[PDB]
Design a protein around this ligand. Structure first.
Ligand SMILES: Cc1cc(C)c(S(N)(=O)=O)c(C)c1
Ligand SMILES: OCCN1CCNCC1
Ligand SMILES: [Zn+2]
Length: 258
């Protein structure tokens, strides 16, 4: 009876196994754009993905992960609200059963169709497993997806999904460039938070881009053909794998703009 999103093991149950679910810096949150404080001291975000080395794609039974070789200083996030250098380890998405829901963060209560998370760990802690034990261990770049025109740079991901339909499937996934998933603007909001799935560790500096990317209806329909179940189990479509907004608890969300 492991955690998931389904009828009896979803977000409102997670606190029983992971009491930090009711902690002081949980994610995601609603971003109240009017109460976000412009911080002129924030720097432009530096996203250096030129040398990124994707390796594999994995259906982990919750989402799919596109995984990167993080054994050298390649694909790094720095600047913005960050001290130091954070290395890309994986990205994944959260999405809905319908275009009207799917994102984890909300903007003035608006839900997007989906949300991309590019997960990075602080190089001062040596790898990912040690970084998640620290309050400044991770930096996650969050990008909203709306349904409209296709995102050409997403199509290589969409096309491999049928090879990883079910939980625990993987496929070689080399030479994928995550720069093709980024919007024009790197304007962002930022706040201290957590993983959004168990173990819900309070180790993340969240950086949420204001400008969404557009994906097509056909691209997101393909995400909704994935399965939460393993091969040879009854089909449970992988949809609505998002945690709802959690209490802000007096944390301040800062804006890089306006
Ligand atoms: C391992 C892992 C899993 C997940 C779902 C996340 S998240 N959703 O971006 O907070 C992170 C940071 C790290
Ligand atoms: O054309 C791609 C459709 N696939 C089929 C099964 N897994 C999800 C996406
Ligand atoms: Zn996520």
């Amino acid at each position: 009876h492991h955690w998931g999103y389904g009828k009896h093991n979803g977000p409102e149950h997670w606190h029983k196994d992971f009491p930090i679910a009711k902690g002081e810096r949980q994610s995601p949150v609603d971003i109240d754009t009017h109460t976000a404080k412009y911080d002129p001291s924030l720097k432009p975000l530096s996203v250096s993905y030129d040398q990124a080395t994707s390796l594999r794609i994995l259906n982990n039974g919750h989402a799919f992960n596109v995984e990167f070789d993080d054994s050298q200083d390649k694909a790094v996030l720095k600047g913005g609200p960050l001290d130091g250098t954070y290395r890309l380890i994986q990205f994944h998405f959260h999405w809905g059963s319908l275009d009207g829901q799917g994102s984890e963060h909300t903007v003035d209560k608006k839900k997007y169709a989906a949300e991309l998370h590019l997960v990075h760990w602080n190089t001062k802690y040596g790898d990912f497993g040690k970084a998640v034990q620290q309050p400044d261990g991770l930096a996650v770049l969050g990008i909203f997806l709306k349904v409209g025109s296709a995102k050409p740079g997403l199509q290589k991901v969409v096309d491999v999904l049928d090879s990883i339909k079910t939980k625990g499937k993987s496929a070689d996934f080399t030479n994928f460039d995550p720069r093709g998933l980024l919007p024009e603007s790197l304007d962002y909001w930022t706040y201290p938070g957590s993983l959004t799935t168990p173990p819900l560790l309070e180790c993340v500096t969240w950086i949420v881009l204001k400008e969404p990317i557009s994906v097509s209806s056909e691209q997101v329909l393909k995400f909704r053909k994935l399965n939460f179940n393993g091969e040879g189990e009854p089909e449970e479509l992988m949809v609505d794998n998002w945690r709802p907004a959690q209490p802000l608890k007096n944390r301040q969300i800062k804006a890089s703009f306006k």
